[PDB]
Amino acid sequence: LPDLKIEKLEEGVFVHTSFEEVNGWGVVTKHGLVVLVNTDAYLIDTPFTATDTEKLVNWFVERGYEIKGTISSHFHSDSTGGIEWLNSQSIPTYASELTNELLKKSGKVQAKYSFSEVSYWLVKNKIEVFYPGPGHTQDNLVVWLPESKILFGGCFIKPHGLGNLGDANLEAWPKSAKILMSKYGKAKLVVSSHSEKGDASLMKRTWEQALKGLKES
C-alpha cells in the first residue's frame, strides 16, 4: 500500500493519511493531524503502523520540529498503532484512562501519560482534548484547535454511515453527538478519520446517522 501522506491544511496544521488492510473493511483510509506550536509538533492520532508513525515523525524532525506529544482519540489501532514505537523513541504518548484500560484489556501497549478530565488541554489555549461521551467507542475523544477553529472528530464523526459497530454505543451516540454540537458550534472545519473534511454541519450529519443507526438496531 502507499506510504503515509502529509498535506498542509493551514498554518501549523497538517493532515496525515495512512492506509491499512483491516479484516472486514478492506483498505481503510485514516486521517489524523499534526499541530505545530512554535518548533514543537503534536500528533493527533498515530497512523496504523510503527512504519507509518516513523515516516510521519521523520518528516517533521527533518524539518526542524521536536515531537513533544501524541494524543490517541480512541483505543482502536487506527489511532494507537504507533504508541509502542513512540514510547521506544521517548516521545510522550497520551490517552485517557478509559482508552488505556481498553488498550490493556485488548493486550495492547498503553500510552505513558493518562488523564480522567472531560476536557484536557494537551497544550494550554492551543490543543483541547474533549470526551463528548460514548459513540463509535466507549472512550472516543475529539481534539479542538481554538486558534484555527478546527475540530478533529476521529471515528466519532460519521456523516455518511457509522462504520464498525463492534465496540459502538448506539444508545449513547445521539446524546454524545448533541453534546459535541453544543460544545463546538463555532467550528470552521471538521476533520474526521474516514470522511471528507467539512464544516460544522458534519456534527449534525453524525447526530442524524447515530439516530438512524440506533432506530435500525
Interface with Zn ion (CB under 5 A) = 76, 78, 155, 193
* Catalytic residue list contains 169: no
Q: Between 45 and 128, whose beta carbon lies closer to Zn ion? A: 45
Task: Name the active-site residue from 78, 100, 139, 140.
Answer: 78
The question of whether 31 is a catalytic residue gets the answer: no
Active site residue 76: yes
Of residues 40, 87, 164, 167, which has the active-site annotation? 164
Distance in Å, CB of 147 to Zn ion, minimum: 26
Which position's Cβ is nearest Zn ion? 76
**Is-contact 22 193, C-beta < 8 A?**
no
Instruction: Return all residues near 141 (Cβ < 8 A) that are at least 6 apart.
Output: 71, 73, 74, 96, 99, 129, 130, 131, 154
Q: Which of 16, 45, 76, 100 is catalytic?
A: 76
Q: Is 139 annotated as a binding residue?
A: no
Q: Which is nearer to Zn ion, 65 or 103 (CB)?
A: 103
Q: Is there a catalytic annotation at residue 74?
A: yes
78 is a catalytic site residue: yes
Residues comprising the binding site?
74, 76, 78, 136, 155, 158, 164, 194
Residues comprising the binding site for Zn(2+)?
74, 76, 78, 136, 155, 194
